[PDB]
Design a protein around this ligand. Sequence first.
Ligand SMILES: [Ca+2]
Ligand SMILES: [Ca+2]
Ligand SMILES: [Ca+2]
Ligand SMILES: [Ca+2]
Ligand SMILES: [Cl-]
Ligand SMILES: [Cl-]
Ligand SMILES: [Cl-]
Ligand SMILES: [Cl-]
Ligand SMILES: [Cl-]
Ligand SMILES: [Cl-]
Ligand SMILES: [Cl-]
Ligand SMILES: [Cl-]
Ligand SMILES: [Cl-]
Ligand SMILES: [Cl-]
Ligand SMILES: [Zn+2]
Ligand SMILES: [Zn+2]
Ligand SMILES: [Zn+2]
Ligand SMILES: [Zn+2]
Ligand SMILES: [Zn+2]
Ligand SMILES: [Zn+2]
Ligand SMILES: [Zn+2]
Ligand SMILES: [Zn+2]
Ligand SMILES: [Zn+2]
Ligand SMILES: [Zn+2]
Ligand SMILES: [Zn+2]
Ligand SMILES: [Zn+2]
Ligand SMILES: [Zn+2]
Ligand SMILES: [Zn+2]
Lengths: 302, 302, 89, 89
Amino acid sequence: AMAQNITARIGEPLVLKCKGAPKKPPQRLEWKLNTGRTEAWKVLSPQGGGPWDSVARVLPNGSLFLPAVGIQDEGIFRCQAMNRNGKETKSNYRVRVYQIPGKPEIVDSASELTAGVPNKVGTCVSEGSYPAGTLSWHLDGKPLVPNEKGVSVKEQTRRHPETGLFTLQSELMVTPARGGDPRPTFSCSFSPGLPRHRALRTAPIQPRVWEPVPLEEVQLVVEPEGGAVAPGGTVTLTCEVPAQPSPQIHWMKDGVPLPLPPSPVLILPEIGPQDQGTYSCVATHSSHGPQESRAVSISIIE
Amino acid sequence: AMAQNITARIGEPLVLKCKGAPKKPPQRLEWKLNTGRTEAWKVLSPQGGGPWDSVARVLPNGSLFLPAVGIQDEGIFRCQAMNRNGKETKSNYRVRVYQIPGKPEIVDSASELTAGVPNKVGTCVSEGSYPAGTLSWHLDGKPLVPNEKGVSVKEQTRRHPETGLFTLQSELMVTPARGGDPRPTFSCSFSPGLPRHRALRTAPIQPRVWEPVPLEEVQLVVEPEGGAVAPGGTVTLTCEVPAQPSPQIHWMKDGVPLPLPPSPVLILPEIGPQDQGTYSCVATHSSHGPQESRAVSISIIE
Amino acid sequence: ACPLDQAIGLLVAIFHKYSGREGDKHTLSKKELKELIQKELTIGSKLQDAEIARLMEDLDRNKDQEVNFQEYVTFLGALALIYNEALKG
Amino acid sequence: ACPLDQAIGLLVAIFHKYSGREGDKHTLSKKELKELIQKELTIGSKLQDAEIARLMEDLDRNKDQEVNFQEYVTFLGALALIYNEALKG
Ligand SMILES: [Ca+2]
Ligand SMILES: [Ca+2]
Ligand SMILES: [Ca+2]
Ligand SMILES: [Ca+2]
Ligand SMILES: [Cl-]
Ligand SMILES: [Cl-]
Ligand SMILES: [Cl-]
Ligand SMILES: [Cl-]
Ligand SMILES: [Cl-]
Ligand SMILES: [Cl-]
Ligand SMILES: [Cl-]
Ligand SMILES: [Cl-]
Ligand SMILES: [Cl-]
Ligand SMILES: [Cl-]
Ligand SMILES: [Zn+2]
Ligand SMILES: [Zn+2]
Ligand SMILES: [Zn+2]
Ligand SMILES: [Zn+2]
Ligand SMILES: [Zn+2]
Ligand SMILES: [Zn+2]
Ligand SMILES: [Zn+2]
Ligand SMILES: [Zn+2]
Ligand SMILES: [Zn+2]
Ligand SMILES: [Zn+2]
Ligand SMILES: [Zn+2]
Ligand SMILES: [Zn+2]
Ligand SMILES: [Zn+2]
Ligand SMILES: [Zn+2]
C-alpha cells in the first residue's frame, strides 16, 4: 500500500525518514502522527522542548527520532515535505512494536505418566512478550496437535498493566494408550506474533509411562508364581480384598468350596497328585453378591 | 524461671491464663504487657473497645485472648490477681512466635559435575520462616560439612518488611576429586530456630561426575586406537593443536624428525616391519619453543 | 515391534511389579528389591544373602532403606556394562 | 573398590570419550554414536550398517540428529535387560 509497515523493537531507537526533504534549512516539512499516547492527530513541531520532546523529536535533516520506542507509540506517522525544486513528497508509516520473551520453561513436569488415564505432563510458561504470541507442543520431534487422541491443552493469556507485556501458559494433558511409547518426549515452543521470527524452544522432557496391572477386587497370589512344584514341599495361596477391612475368604478347589473355615491363607504342604487342580478364593459379604479371585492352576513336575 | 516461656504460631489464636483468678465477677485482676506494638509497659483494660481490642482482649474468666498472634506481639505478659480468699497470684509469660516455611527447594541444580574444578551443585531456597532458621546439606545420606575437602557454601538471609518473614538461600559448591563417586547424592534441609521441630527436607538430587581426560597442547590420535596392525594395510596418524589456527606439524619417528614437509596427517600404508617404531608430532611456532605430542608405539601382529 | 520400546517398557513393568507389594508403591523395600534381583536378573542367581545385602546397600544412596526408580535406573546402567564385558568372553 | 562405582564411572567416561570428538562435546553425533556402539558394545558387533542406522534413529527421540546423555542412559537401560535374557540361555 501507500503506508509502509514499520516494525520496531520495544526499548530501541527508531528513525523515520521524511523522504524528499532537504538535508539543510530552509526546509518545508511537517510531521503528523496519531499514536496511543496522543489518541488524536497531532502536529509534531520541529522546535525543541515540545510536549513530546522526551519521546519523539524532529532531527535537523527532517527525520523523526524516537530514542526508546514503546507500545503506546504504535500508530500512524506521516511526513509531508516540499523539495527545493520543489514538488510535494509524502512519507506514510504504520508503526507496530514487539518484544521477544525469555526462553520458555516447562514447570511442574511429571516424571512418570499413568497409562489409561489423563496426566498433566507439565505447564509451558512464557513471560515478557508483545504481542501475545502463541505456545505449541512437540512430541517425539514432531508437532503435537490437541484434542486428537486424548491430548488436551489448557491455555491462558495474561497482560501485565505495569508494562503491557504478556504472560502465556499452556498446560498439556495426555492419556497414554496401553502398549504405547514407554518414554514419550515432549518440548514446548513460543512463536512470536511479531516479527517473523524463529521459534523459542524449551529443552525436551522424557517422562516414562507406567502401565498399571488391572486391579482385581479379590487379589490372589501364589508362591511359587507359576503354580507348578516338584513332588512334596509346599504351595502357599494368599488372597486379599483391598476394599474390605475384615474380608471373609472361602477357598475353592475346581469351582467347589473346600470344607474349611474362612481364612485369608491356604497352605498345601506335601503336595501329591491328588492336590492338583484349579484353585481360587471367594470373598463373601453381607448384602452383597460374593466375589471370586482369579483362578490358579496348581500342578506337579518330575 | 518465674517467667513461663510461651511459643505460639503466627496467625493462630492464643490464650494466656490469669492463674488464681475467680471465674466470675467480682474479680481483682490486672494485665500488664510490653510488646513490639506498645514499645512500653501498658495496662490492658478488661473493658471492650480498648486501644488494642482488635489484637488482645480480656476474657470474662480473666484470661487474655489474642485471636491472631503476630511477630509484634512478642514480649512480656503479666497478670496480677487476687483470689476471693484471697491471696495475690501472679502469672508471668514470655511470648515468642514462629512460622514454618513451605518445603525447601533446590533450584538451578547441575545435571553433570566436572571433576577437579569447583561446581555449583545448586541453590537451596526457603521462603516464609520466622525466626530465620538455618539451611544445611546432606551427602549420600549423611550431613555435609562445609569448607572441608573442596566443599563450600554461600549463604544469605533476607527479611521481607511486608510480613517480617525470612527468605534463606544456600548455594553449594563442590570440587569432585578424580576417582570419586560417579553419582553423588545431595539433599537440603531446613531447621526451624523455633520451635523444636523435625527438619523439612528436599527431594534428593543425583548429579553425575564427568572426569575430563587431561588435555594435551598437541593432541595425537591414531587409527586404529591400539597402534598394532596386521601385515600390510594402513595406519593413519592425525595430530592437532587446539590453541593454534595454523599449526606447523612436523612428524617424528623414534625421536627423529622425518624427511617430510609440515603436515597435520601422516599415513603409513603397506606397513612392513621397517615401519615399526615410536611416532610423535612436533608443533613448531615462531617466538615459542616447540611442543611435542604423546608418543605412540606402532607395531605389527601375525 | 521396536525391540527398544519392548525392553524399556519391560524394565518399567518389572520395577512396579515388585515396588507395589508393600509400603510406598513406587519404591523398592529391601524385601521387594531382593525378590526382584533374585527372580528377574541373571546377576542375582550366583549372589549369596550377604552379597545381596551389600548390593542393596550400595543401591540406596540417600539411605532411606528404599530404592526409587532413579536409583534403579543407574543400577541397570551399571548392569549393562557389566553384562557387556561378560558377553565378550 | 565398589564394582558399581567402577561400572557407572565407566559409562560416563565412555560417553564423553566419543561425544567430545566433534560438534557439541556432550552429545553424540551419528558418527560418534556409531563408533561407540561398534567399538565398546557387544550388541554392535553383529549389527550391519543399515541396522545401526535404524538403531541410532530410535535413540534420537527429539530428532535433532544428536544423542544426549539421557537418550544414552535409556539405551543402556534397555541393553541391560536385553543382555540379561541372553545370559539365561
Ligand atoms: Ca514398595
Ligand atoms: Ca533410596
Ligand atoms: Ca559430539
Ligand atoms: Ca536427541
Ligand atoms: Cl512413539
Ligand atoms: Cl509417543
Ligand atoms: Cl464357611
Ligand atoms: Cl561416596
Ligand atoms: Cl560422594
Ligand atoms: Cl620442516
Ligand atoms: Cl515410580
Ligand atoms: Cl517373569
Ligand atoms: Cl553430558
Ligand atoms: Cl576400550
Ligand atoms: Zn505484573
Ligand atoms: Zn513416542
Ligand atoms: Zn529475531
Ligand atoms: Zn466358607
Ligand atoms: Zn517481600
Ligand atoms: Zn558418594
Ligand atoms: Zn511441628
Ligand atoms: Zn619439518
Ligand atoms: Zn526400534
Ligand atoms: Zn512409578
Ligand atoms: Zn519377570
Ligand atoms: Zn559396592
Ligand atoms: Zn557431559
Ligand atoms: Zn572402551
